[PDB]
Design a protein around this motif. Sequence first.
Motif, PDB file in Angstrom:
ATOM      1  N   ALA A 165       0.824  -1.206   0.000  1.00  8.62           N
ATOM      2  CA  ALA A 165       0.000   0.000   0.000  1.00  8.62           C
ATOM      3  C   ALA A 165       0.859   1.258   0.000  1.00  8.62           C
ATOM      4  CB  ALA A 165      -0.935  -0.014   1.206  1.00  8.62           C
ATOM      5  N   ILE A 166       1.949   1.250   0.770  1.00 12.57           N
ATOM      6  CA  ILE A 166       2.813   2.423   0.811  1.00 12.57           C
ATOM      7  C   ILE A 166       3.522   2.612  -0.525  1.00 12.57           C
ATOM      8  CG2 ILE A 166       4.865   1.269   1.747  1.00 12.57           C
ATOM      9  CD1 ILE A 166       5.047   3.761   3.669  1.00 12.57           C
ATOM     10  N   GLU A 167       3.879   1.517  -1.205  1.00 11.19           N
ATOM     11  CA  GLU A 167       4.462   1.642  -2.537  1.00 11.19           C
ATOM     12  C   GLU A 167       3.429   2.125  -3.547  1.00 11.19           C
ATOM     13  OE1 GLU A 167       6.199  -2.135  -3.368  1.00 11.19           O
ATOM     14  OE2 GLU A 167       8.106  -1.667  -2.387  1.00 11.19           O
ATOM     15  N   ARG A 168       2.172   1.706  -3.389  1.00 11.96           N
ATOM     16  CA  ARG A 168       1.109   2.199  -4.260  1.00 11.96           C
ATOM     17  C   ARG A 168       0.917   3.701  -4.091  1.00 11.96           C
ATOM     18  NH1 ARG A 168      -5.205   0.016  -4.176  1.00 11.96           N
ATOM     19  NH2 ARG A 168      -6.058   1.572  -5.631  1.00 11.96           N
ATOM     20  N   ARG A 169       0.919   4.176  -2.843  1.00 17.00           N
ATOM     21  CA  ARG A 169       0.784   5.611  -2.605  1.00 17.00           C
ATOM     22  C   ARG A 169       2.001   6.373  -3.118  1.00 17.00           C
ATOM     23  NH1 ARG A 169      -2.871   9.319  -2.652  1.00 17.00           N
ATOM     24  NH2 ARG A 169      -4.210   8.202  -1.161  1.00 17.00           N
ATOM     25  N   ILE A 170       3.196   5.791  -2.980  1.00 19.76           N
ATOM     26  CA  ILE A 170       4.396   6.426  -3.518  1.00 19.76           C
ATOM     27  C   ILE A 170       4.306   6.534  -5.036  1.00 19.76           C
ATOM     28  CG2 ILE A 170       6.800   5.864  -4.053  1.00 19.76           C
ATOM     29  CD1 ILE A 170       7.415   5.567  -1.241  1.00 19.76           C
ATOM     30  N   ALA A 171       3.798   5.490  -5.692  1.00 19.58           N
ATOM     31  CA  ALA A 171       3.624   5.535  -7.140  1.00 19.58           C
ATOM     32  C   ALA A 171       2.590   6.581  -7.536  1.00 19.58           C
ATOM     33  CB  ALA A 171       3.226   4.154  -7.664  1.00 19.58           C
ATOM     34  N   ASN A 172       1.512   6.695  -6.755  1.00 12.95           N
ATOM     35  CA  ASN A 172       0.515   7.728  -7.024  1.00 12.95           C
ATOM     36  C   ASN A 172       1.121   9.122  -6.913  1.00 12.95           C
ATOM     37  OD1 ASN A 172      -1.484   5.891  -7.556  1.00 12.95           O
ATOM     38  ND2 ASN A 172      -2.848   6.546  -5.896  1.00 12.95           N
ATOM     39  N   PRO A 183      14.493   2.223  -7.401  1.00 13.00           N
ATOM     40  CA  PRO A 183      13.917   1.095  -6.652  1.00 13.00           C
ATOM     41  C   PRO A 183      14.549   0.900  -5.282  1.00 13.00           C
ATOM     42  CG  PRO A 183      14.324   0.477  -8.930  1.00 13.00           C
ATOM     43  CD  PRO A 183      14.961   1.819  -8.738  1.00 13.00           C
ATOM     44  N   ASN A 184      15.883   0.886  -5.225  1.00 10.61           N
ATOM     45  CA  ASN A 184      16.560   0.762  -3.937  1.00 10.61           C
ATOM     46  C   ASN A 184      16.292   1.977  -3.060  1.00 10.61           C
ATOM     47  OD1 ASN A 184      17.958   2.432  -5.640  1.00 10.61           O
ATOM     48  ND2 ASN A 184      19.902   1.315  -5.526  1.00 10.61           N
ATOM     49  N   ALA A 185      16.193   3.161  -3.669  1.00 13.68           N
ATOM     50  CA  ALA A 185      15.810   4.355  -2.925  1.00 13.68           C
ATOM     51  C   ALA A 185      14.409   4.209  -2.349  1.00 13.68           C
ATOM     52  CB  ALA A 185      15.897   5.586  -3.830  1.00 13.68           C
ATOM     53  N   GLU A 186      13.492   3.636  -3.131  1.00 20.69           N
ATOM     54  CA  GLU A 186      12.139   3.398  -2.638  1.00 20.69           C
ATOM     55  C   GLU A 186      12.142   2.412  -1.477  1.00 20.69           C
ATOM     56  OE1 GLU A 186       9.485   1.049  -4.968  1.00 20.69           O
ATOM     57  OE2 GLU A 186       7.805   2.441  -4.712  1.00 20.69           O
ATOM     58  N   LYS A 187      12.951   1.354  -1.574  1.00 16.83           N
ATOM     59  CA  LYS A 187      13.039   0.390  -0.481  1.00 16.83           C
ATOM     60  C   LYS A 187      13.591   1.037   0.784  1.00 16.83           C
ATOM     61  CE  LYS A 187      14.296  -4.258   0.596  1.00 16.83           C
ATOM     62  NZ  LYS A 187      14.589  -3.957   2.025  1.00 16.83           N
ATOM     63  N   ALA A 188      14.654   1.834   0.649  1.00 19.08           N
ATOM     64  CA  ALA A 188      15.201   2.540   1.804  1.00 19.08           C
ATOM     65  C   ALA A 188      14.177   3.502   2.395  1.00 19.08           C
ATOM     66  CB  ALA A 188      16.475   3.286   1.409  1.00 19.08           C
ATOM     67  N   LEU A 189      13.380   4.146   1.539  1.00 15.17           N
ATOM     68  CA  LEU A 189      12.325   5.030   2.020  1.00 15.17           C
ATOM     69  C   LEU A 189      11.283   4.257   2.820  1.00 15.17           C
ATOM     70  CD1 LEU A 189      10.640   7.491   2.317  1.00 15.17           C
ATOM     71  CD2 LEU A 189      10.258   7.562  -0.146  1.00 15.17           C
ATOM     72  N   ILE A 190      10.881   3.085   2.326  1.00 18.38           N
ATOM     73  CA  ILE A 190       9.907   2.273   3.052  1.00 18.38           C
ATOM     74  C   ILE A 190      10.498   1.790   4.372  1.00 18.38           C
ATOM     75  CG2 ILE A 190       8.375   0.275   2.914  1.00 18.38           C
ATOM     76  CD1 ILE A 190       7.950   2.806   0.991  1.00 18.38           C
ATOM     77  N   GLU A 191      11.818   1.594   4.412  1.00 17.23           N
ATOM     78  CA  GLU A 191      12.449   1.093   5.628  1.00 17.23           C
ATOM     79  C   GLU A 191      12.407   2.113   6.762  1.00 17.23           C
ATOM     80  OE1 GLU A 191      13.188  -1.030   8.182  1.00 17.23           O
ATOM     81  OE2 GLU A 191      13.388  -2.169   6.316  1.00 17.23           O
ATOM     82  N   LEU A 192      12.581   3.399   6.456  1.00 21.58           N
ATOM     83  CA  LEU A 192      12.616   4.443   7.473  1.00 21.58           C
ATOM     84  C   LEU A 192      11.248   5.071   7.727  1.00 21.58           C
ATOM     85  CD1 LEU A 192      12.730   7.366   5.609  1.00 21.58           C
ATOM     86  CD2 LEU A 192      14.989   6.387   5.167  1.00 21.58           C
ATOM     87  N   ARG A 198       2.800  10.090   6.765  1.00 20.41           N
ATOM     88  CA  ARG A 198       3.221  11.476   6.957  1.00 20.41           C
ATOM     89  C   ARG A 198       4.721  11.630   6.746  1.00 20.41           C
ATOM     90  NH1 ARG A 198      -1.236  14.356  10.166  1.00 20.41           N
ATOM     91  NH2 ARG A 198      -2.254  12.671  11.342  1.00 20.41           N
ATOM     92  N   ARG A 199       5.513  10.754   7.369  1.00 22.02           N
ATOM     93  CA  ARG A 199       6.963  10.815   7.219  1.00 22.02           C
ATOM     94  C   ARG A 199       7.375  10.617   5.767  1.00 22.02           C
ATOM     95  NH1 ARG A 199      11.557   9.534  10.459  1.00 22.02           N
ATOM     96  NH2 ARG A 199      13.332  10.418   9.304  1.00 22.02           N
ATOM     97  N   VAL A 200       6.748   9.659   5.079  1.00 23.52           N
ATOM     98  CA  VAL A 200       7.092   9.391   3.684  1.00 23.52           C
ATOM     99  C   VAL A 200       6.820  10.616   2.824  1.00 23.52           C
ATOM    100  CG1 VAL A 200       6.830   7.771   1.785  1.00 23.52           C
ATOM    101  CG2 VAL A 200       6.477   7.010   4.129  1.00 23.52           C
ATOM    102  N   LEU A 201       5.638  11.217   2.980  1.00 25.47           N
ATOM    103  CA  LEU A 201       5.295  12.389   2.179  1.00 25.47           C
ATOM    104  C   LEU A 201       6.231  13.555   2.485  1.00 25.47           C
ATOM    105  CD1 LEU A 201       1.386  12.264   2.224  1.00 25.47           C
ATOM    106  CD2 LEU A 201       2.929  11.757   0.319  1.00 25.47           C
ATOM    107  N   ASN A 202       6.521  13.777   3.770  1.00 26.94           N
ATOM    108  CA  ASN A 202       7.394  14.879   4.158  1.00 26.94           C
ATOM    109  C   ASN A 202       8.787  14.713   3.567  1.00 26.94           C
ATOM    110  OD1 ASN A 202       5.598  16.475   5.800  1.00 26.94           O
ATOM    111  ND2 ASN A 202       5.724  14.868   7.362  1.00 26.94           N
ATOM    112  N   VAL A 203       9.386  13.530   3.735  1.00 28.33           N
ATOM    113  CA  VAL A 203      10.730  13.328   3.214  1.00 28.33           C
ATOM    114  C   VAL A 203      10.740  13.267   1.694  1.00 28.33           C
ATOM    115  CG1 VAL A 203      11.387  12.142   5.336  1.00 28.33           C
ATOM    116  CG2 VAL A 203      10.672  10.820   3.338  1.00 28.33           C
TER     117      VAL A 203
END
Lengths: 327, 340, 338, 255, 319
Positions: A165-172, A183-192, A198-203
């Motif tokens: 779901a978080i990857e779906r929202r990131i793709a949106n 892709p690896n950047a996206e994985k690191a983003l999901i990790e933190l 909120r944190r994902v959108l802010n960063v």
Amino acid sequence: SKENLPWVEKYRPETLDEVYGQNEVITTVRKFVDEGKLPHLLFYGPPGTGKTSTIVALAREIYGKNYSNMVLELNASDDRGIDVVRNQIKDFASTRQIFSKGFKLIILDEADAMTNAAQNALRRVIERYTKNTRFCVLANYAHKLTPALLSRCTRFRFQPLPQEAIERRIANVLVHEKLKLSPNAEKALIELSNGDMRRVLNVLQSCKATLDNPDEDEISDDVIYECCGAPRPSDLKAVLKSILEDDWGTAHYTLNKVRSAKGLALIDLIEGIVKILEDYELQNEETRVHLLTKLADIEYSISKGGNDQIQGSAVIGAIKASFENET
Amino acid sequence: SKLAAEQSLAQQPWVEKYRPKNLDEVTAQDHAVTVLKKTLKSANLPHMLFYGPPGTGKTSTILALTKELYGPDLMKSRILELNASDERGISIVREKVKNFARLTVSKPSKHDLENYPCPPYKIIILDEADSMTADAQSALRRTMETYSGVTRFCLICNYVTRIIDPLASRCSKFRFKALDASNAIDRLRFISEQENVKCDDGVLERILDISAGDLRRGITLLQSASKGAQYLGDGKNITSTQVEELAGVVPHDILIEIVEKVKSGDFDEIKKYVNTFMKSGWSAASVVNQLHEYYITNDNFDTNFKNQISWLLFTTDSRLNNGTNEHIQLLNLLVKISQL
Amino acid sequence: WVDKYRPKSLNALSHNEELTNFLKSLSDQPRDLPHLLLYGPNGTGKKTRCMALLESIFGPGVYRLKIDVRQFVTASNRKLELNVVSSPYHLEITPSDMGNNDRIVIQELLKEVAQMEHRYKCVIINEANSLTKDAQAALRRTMEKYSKNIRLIMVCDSMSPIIAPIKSRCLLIRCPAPSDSEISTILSDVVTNERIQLETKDILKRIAQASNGNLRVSLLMLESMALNNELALKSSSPIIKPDWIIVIHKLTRKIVKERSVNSLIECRAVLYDLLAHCIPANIILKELTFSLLDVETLNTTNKSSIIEYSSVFDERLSLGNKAIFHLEGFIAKVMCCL
Amino acid sequence: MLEAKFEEASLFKRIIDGFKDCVQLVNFQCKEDGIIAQAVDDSRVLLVSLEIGVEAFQEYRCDHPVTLGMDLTSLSKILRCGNNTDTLTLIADNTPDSIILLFEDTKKDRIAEYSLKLMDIDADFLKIEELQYDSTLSLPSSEFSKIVRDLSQLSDSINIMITKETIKFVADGDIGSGSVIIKPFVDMEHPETSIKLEMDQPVDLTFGAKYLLDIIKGSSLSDRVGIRLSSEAPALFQFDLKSGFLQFFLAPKFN
Amino acid sequence: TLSLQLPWVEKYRPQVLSDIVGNKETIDRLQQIAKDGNMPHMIISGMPGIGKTTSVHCLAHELLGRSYADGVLELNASDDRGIDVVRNQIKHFAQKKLHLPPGKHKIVILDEADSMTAGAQQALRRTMELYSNSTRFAFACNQSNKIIEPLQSRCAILRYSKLSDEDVLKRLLQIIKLEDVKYTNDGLEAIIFTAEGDMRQAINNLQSTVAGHGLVNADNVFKIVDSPHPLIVKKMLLASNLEDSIQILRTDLWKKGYSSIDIVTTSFRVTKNLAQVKESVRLEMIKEIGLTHMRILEGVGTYLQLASMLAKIHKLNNK
DNA sequence: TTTTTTTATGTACTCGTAGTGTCT
DNA sequence: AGACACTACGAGTACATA
Ligand SMILES: Nc1ncnc2c1ncn2[C@@H]1O[C@H](COP(=O)(O)OP(=O)(O)OP(O)(O)=S)[C@@H](O)[C@H]1O
Ligand SMILES: Nc1ncnc2c1ncn2[C@@H]1O[C@H](COP(=O)(O)OP(=O)(O)OP(O)(O)=S)[C@@H](O)[C@H]1O
Ligand SMILES: Nc1ncnc2c1ncn2[C@@H]1O[C@H](COP(=O)(O)OP(=O)(O)OP(O)(O)=S)[C@@H](O)[C@H]1O
Ligand SMILES: Nc1ncnc2c1ncn2[C@@H]1O[C@H](COP(=O)(O)OP(=O)(O)O)[C@@H](O)[C@H]1O
Ligand SMILES: [Mg+2]
Ligand SMILES: [Mg+2]
Ligand SMILES: [Mg+2]
């Protein structure tokens, strides 16, 4: 215009189809509303899971675009006492709608900061006026609510956002913005993120600002790590290896150069080493006991300040003495 | 007008005299000011939460950002600054902050829009958010969540743990890094050249080394050294010894005496030497830090001894960070490390 | 007397010549002066040196001061009464005269003095160690917002309870206790001016050896023993010790003599009698531990445990409010150790 | 740029006093045809709709539609700062912010300049309710306010019943009960004391005492008040002014 | 959507004392009281959702017949119940004249009596004493200790207990028969297990599961309603090896979104109400849990603190 | 056998000067 | 025009807190 709101506010879900992560509760609530039997709801969950967005989209789907008038939304920002209940909530529940015909909705957002007397007065308002109005209580901690009030509502636990779901929202978001992500950047983003949108959108906004380009390039792991100041798994494992195997002075030099080359924080390194050592298959649990105790003590001491070098040496010595029992 | 401000800055201590006025004066905290400069051209400034060690430039960064955003005219009309010297209970947060947030943004003048971006929102900053109670903090949640279209919230703190998790999630976390010699030597050299501070080769880098990631303390030490060198009038250069003398650092020989008393000596001799050393005023935190540096850096002790010395120094620092008696804690530390 | 012979300027100081020169350097240019924090042992002479530095920054009228009163209203109708030491060039506040209401007085009074304003008015915060963390946090931003009208000179005995932001926001000046030789030279001038009769000068040295660098205690003890010897000190004049020190010594004798609960009851009674007569518990614990370590009957194993328990219970007392609840616990732990 | 000048400065005071207690914040929409305002109670039980045409304004100039969000506990204080034989002037720049009130005396030379900071109210208020009602009555405002204030002391709920040429106000409480019954008559000697009633189907519904007491506070505006009732519809309590009206849409209590 | 239906807790709310499947002794007592009359002052205490308010409502209804409207004075915690109300309204109701049968009395029902102030409770003493021949008082509370002893001395005390498995199962079977719902034995077992003697919560969970999935099965009940919070915490604390407790804390509690404050509070409550281990080890575990809670409240609440708490508890259990 | 222990907001009571509609 | 019952909003004083 919506182009001035931050990404956390700009991308707030307006319909129930834009709330990702929660599927078992979203479908059940949709069925409750379509079939008509909507009981008193208690959305309990961590911050940033989408409880407020869920209930706002629900009220929008129920009452239409005039939601802001047919729903009584109270929160911690507003004065919520026992007299406030007695007057406002009872007058809202006892009366009917001024814009249409139908049941009413009282959204008690962040109701974990309400007084015990207020909840004791409201628990009989929920039970008396139950044919013309409903109650929705949003909470992050279920211990601040009285058991009587906790038993009158159907509890829905908002789980942390999963990877899909978080990857779906990131793709949106990457579709809505002229932005590309590795892709690896996206994985690191999901990790933190720990399931916090909120944190994902802010960063994401912050790393888009960090790009310094007209956005013809991509966002790699380096951008994310340099913008959020989070340590990389490479430096994390290097510090852990130098602590476990190398010499005391060499380990101190390695920790110093790692924490000073990228300006990393000692608490982030502590949490990272704790997360990494959780997978280590170890011997007799005494080493794990000592490690956890000393690391938690050092974290609690860091949470109040002190000498960063002394605390780093303490972390090194604690890990070393904990692993010395594994032989 | 402006000349009075220039003279007042020139008659001001170097900490306030060289306060960063623009986002370019920030020397080391580049990751945050890059985003702050990018959002200056856009209009999507999110809620921010500055956290880090003291003296890293959080207040200076937010002041420079608000200036570059609003101009010296709208600087006093679109800003709500709440410090720790004011009341910040639930009542204040509910009445004053919410009334300011619900209010509309003030109209910019004709001279404002011609030189400054003038975003359609105002800024409410809360300095030293560690003293804010958790209930007054949770009261700010929906206040900053619903009125985000007209106001933006900037929290500033030293310990990010003192702020509740929902508020830390709503705001973008900006961690300010410690200002060591590497990323602050340029700023220190600029301050020294602007004041004609004639020093030796390894003075400035040493000053920050004593500062331990604190540019304010380093600038204060530089100002003190410059005053002490101008009073003498000898025309020589400031030395690292003269700097570490007024910085509260114990001399090397006095520390070597402590190492000798710890290595060789019983409880009575150590207690007597500690009683004599406490007569000369030294901060116990600095003594503990110097002992830690010496013991961890010296390649003449066993690793088993090093784990114990590190844990003992950690415990001593944690106890000293609570307002305890320096004499008792120092004596206990030296006795515990002498039994090793 | 201590007050009859006290320096009033920087050129009148008679010990720590390097500190006097540093103060003269810092007072050469008085307008570009940052906030100062004087730290060091209690009784060294930092409060005299701060006034001497003010005498160099301003005219000699800094010592002609007056005591006024100011009232404050807290969140309730409890009226906070605080007396203020004021001068036509500076003012002195002591937030150690009340409970948890230090923040209110600090913020309100400092804002009033800063809004009303060489060109600035100096502020002397006495005993900054008693300042609660909330009051220090409130003063954190007041120190920086008003830097052209208010300069703080905080006098304290240990920077341990002072927060790191306040430490960074002001220069730190250490005042080491004067050597026994300087104390002896000062006592010599005092006894030649007060017309005391010394059979042998070395007694003055012993006074220093009984004061542990404290000049305030040294002069007071010299004058107290000069009244017992009738203005003529002999070669074997007894050392006048305060009453609480004798009570603590008797308490340690009782501790090392008997270790039981029946003795713990009378120990608690002695602690109550000491606390009820305006004696802080931290000083009580410090003196009790230091005089217990002096007991030659114990060994290193006992003294190490004693100092460890004293550090632990000092942390407890610094984190607690019921001081006897920690003092009795430390005494019981020492009894269990011996 | 909004520029309005009232004929009497006390009319705006009497108008704002109507909403002073039952409404907290307001959002005045100013257009070329007049000033409209719609507000919702904190408990969201009543809706206030005020409309004042350009006939009331002695002078009026509205270049473009203006939105003025403000608070009433401050506007009432600003209005009480005026005088009985003064004239009122509302000024607002091109961008709505910090509305300016000007009180000018007509007998002497006096200028009272007051300011009011606007507030950004996100909730729009443009809804209009135009539906046929089951009964439409008209009675003197003083006669209705008297009955309301007299029956509010008995209980907290007042029931209105409209039947064939019969208007009944019932109030049943703990200290007793009461019911005032009136019949629609035509008074030729004075038209402002007559009671008119046009009914299509009998009506029976209850209101709360507090909102009914707050509504009758607007009786100082007009000498006659109209009441429109319908089957489960917001009751329309209307006071008609010589340039517009003030209408309270009150929501009954479910039984 | 235009309107909703009444919930099964309110729709099937008992209106006769026979429909109550609560404590049989007190139920038959109140039934015989309503049959014979002469209802005395009473205070009903217990836990939420066991049939306290419904019991007194049924008693008052059966005892007053059609005179319930003008002979029963209901005052909940939602209404003002201070000294002024007790002085004016309660006294006016007790002094009110009313022609009743020679076996009935006016009833003053006071819901949530544990929330009334001390002044009102003190004033109620003589109020209920001077009019004890034409006005009777029935209090319904959760903690009888919150009511002053003088008030308890003038009334009977009825302590309601938890509902056993059989009673809640019988009531749910009656509701299913009255509603024609598809169910299974394991689903009803899971419902009763997640209810924990709470009949209202049981009926609410049943209705929610029915309206969300249609079939009352253990899988559906578990997917819509999570397992009870204290039981997983108890299983975590009662673990024998450190790794098992750590895995439980990670997967069941931390990976599902349970806040650290809730976890430490549940651990404290479980250790307080624990009976498997001795008193001294329980006190030591409570001490460690409180030491952890002191850090959780200061904002240092993370997974590492809970892991260290579990490690310290295991070290205490490690002899 | 016997009486006080900070600050912090929510709750409840009372007296209380005050603002305005009504009566000889 | 005016006097004084009715009244509602504001400072004071305590009382709990799982
Ligand atoms: N499931 C989700 N799908 C999409 N966006 C989400 C989701 N959850 C959170 N967000 C984003 O995060 C923002 C904040 O969501 P909220 O519902 O306010 O968080 P919350 O669950 O209510 O937790 P609180 O408010 O701290 S108690 C939303 O406006 C979205 O942008
Ligand atoms: N990055 C920086 N660049 C230049 N000067 C700096 C920087 N950081 C700090 N300073 C200097 O230090 C002074 C204090 O800055 P502040 O922003 O108040 O520090 P701080 O981070 O707020 O510390 P606090 O308030 O105790 S949390 C400034 O006026 C500058 O003179
Ligand atoms: N013994 C019972 N038999 C049948 N239904 C019951 C029983 N007890 C409770 N219920 C159901 O639970 C609902 C609420 O019961 P209540 O009596 O209000 O709970 P309670 O025991 O009073 O606890 P409170 O009100 O939280 S203090 C009723 O409407 C019934 O649907
Ligand atoms: N340089 C000095 N020469 C002689 N006496 C001094 C000197 N400095 C301080 N004193 C003595 O110290 C006394 C005051 O001590 P004080 O400064 O109050 O102690 P503290 O430093 O703990 O505040 C004075 O009576 C004065 O005689
Ligand atoms: Mg929310
Ligand atoms: Mg700051
Ligand atoms: Mg009940």
